[PDB]
Amino acid sequence: KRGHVLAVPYPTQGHITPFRQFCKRLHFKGLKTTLALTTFVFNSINPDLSGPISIATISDGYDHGGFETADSIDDYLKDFKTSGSKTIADIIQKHQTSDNPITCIVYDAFLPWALDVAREFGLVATPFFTQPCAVNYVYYLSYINNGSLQLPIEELPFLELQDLPSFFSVSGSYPAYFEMVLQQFINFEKADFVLVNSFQELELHENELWSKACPVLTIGPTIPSIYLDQRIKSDTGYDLNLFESKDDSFCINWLDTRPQGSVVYVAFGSMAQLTNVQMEELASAVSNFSFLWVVRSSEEEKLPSGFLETVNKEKSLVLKWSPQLQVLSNKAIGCFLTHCGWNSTMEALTFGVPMVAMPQWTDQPMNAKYIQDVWKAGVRVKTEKESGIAKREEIEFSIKEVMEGERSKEMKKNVKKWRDLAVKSLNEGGSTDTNIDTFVSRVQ
Ligand SMILES: O=c1ccn([C@@H]2O[C@H](COP(=O)(O)OP(=O)(O)O)[C@@H](O)[C@H]2O)c(=O)[nH]1
Ligand SMILES: *[C@@H]1O[C@H](CO)[C@@H](O)[C@H](O[C@@H]2O[C@H](CO)[C@@H](O)[C@H](O)[C@H]2O)[C@H]1O
Ligand SMILES: *[C@@H]1O[C@H](CO)[C@@H](O)[C@H](O)[C@H]1O
Ligand SMILES: O=C(O)c1ccccc1Br
């Protein structure tokens, strides 16, 4: 009972959730964990604090308003390193006299500066990569090559420019984020271990490649235990949400009244914004189906005028936020029109829901390439090269490819092989269970 992990996610939903899920696994294995949330995120959730995972607050330098009150991404990341370094140190110091002092920092790989704090205090230090091995390996090759990528990549020759992370195909876009994803590797060799939110059997070749450069430990998927291995019965869902849902049994009750495989689920995660023009092509394409579409509140204005009040309440539903795990497990879902965020992707793969891939930016084009041509679990929507927009007829065609065709019948069979592979990996003797055991042993 000696070890104590302080877990520091990048402060977005897609990073907080896999960190929190990993903490529930460590707790089941007997390791105490404290999750570090920024003050702004803490004061927006109002989390429940009678749980097996404690919460500490740190500062990114923007406690009042959060990221949206920062001038720029570069200012934000630099203030986060300043304020985060000082406030992580503060948490460590505050726990020193305690029964269980902090012994280990599991920090988001996006934040390599946390390793320096961990090393100043003599702690175990491990970066946690929330993106899959293939993406991280590609970023690692570019970091080694001063930020450039010569296609083709000898070890992954099937990758084309349009399959790379958007930083490589959209020149100069988001330079602060591009620098951040490359600098994940500035010191990762010096960590005790390198953790990855994936499972070995999903990316055998890429995991093998990346491990030659640095031993990594796959400890995923971070899907709650009740849906896969079921060894942790208290792990029944995602219980740290930055977005409010209208308590929606209403959403799952509505899907219960629908025929099997008949509903098109559409969602673009927590962050990605589509333009007016892209929302128009989408709204038109999906209106040819029974659909369940999450449109985030801030995105509603970009819908075509009067769209929300001409959804026929019998076949279709538009939500502000969904219980996506429960949706993706419901039998009424025929396919998942997704932006290919890695959590939505792994959730789709493991629930056996075939995908329509509409990637937007950072690593999503990679996940989209793997969904279609490696895991063969869906089709990527075609976007016009000059305009960059996926037009309504191309979106409707891709959904039909996944719902009905001969392609369709194949991608169903292929996507259900992955649930069992993950269950095996999380069960005793599996790849992920052993790797988590190795990490727990080192921490205590
Ligand atoms: O309406 C929604 C949309 C997304 N999610 C969850 O939010 C996470 C989104 O993470 P992902 O890596 O897919 O995308 P990001 O939001 O980081 O771009 C996932 O755990 C989804 O299940 C949800 O619960 N309800
Ligand atoms: C990364 O930069 C982009 C802007 O290019 C931001 O959208 C993102 O900020 C996140 O926004 C989310 C709201 O949709 C918040 O949940 C999250 O806390 C915040 O970090 C930047 O991180
Ligand atoms: C950065 O750019 C993408 C568009 O390519 C958008 O989806 C994100 O919302 C934005 O932060
Ligand atoms: O890679 C991601 O998904 C990501 C998430 C949040 C903020 C920045 C990025 Br670049």
Residue numbers in the entry: 4 to 447
From the manuscript:
UGT74F1 and UGT74F2 are the enzymes responsible for the in vivo glucosylation of SA in A. thaliana. UDP and SA interact primarily with residues in the C- and N-terminal domain, respectively.
To verify the presence of a single SA in the binding domain, we co-crystallized UGT74F2 with the SA analog 2-BA. Collection of an anomalous X-ray diffraction set showed a single anomalous peak in the SA binding pocket. Over 300 crystals were screened and, generally, co-crystallization of the protein with UDP/UDP-glucose and SA produced a smaller fraction of well-diffracting crystals (diffraction resolution up to 2.5 Å, ~5%) than the protein co-crystallized with UDP/UDP-glucose and 2-BA (~60%). Therefore, we propose that SA binds to UGT74F2 primarily in the conformation described for the UDP/SA complex (i.e. carboxyl group of SA interacting with His 18 and Thr 15) but binds to UGT74F1 primarily in the conformation modeled on the basis of 2-BA in the 2-BA/UDP complexes of UGT74F2 wild-type or T15S (i.e. SA hydroxyl interacting with His 18 and SA carboxyl interacting with Thr 365).
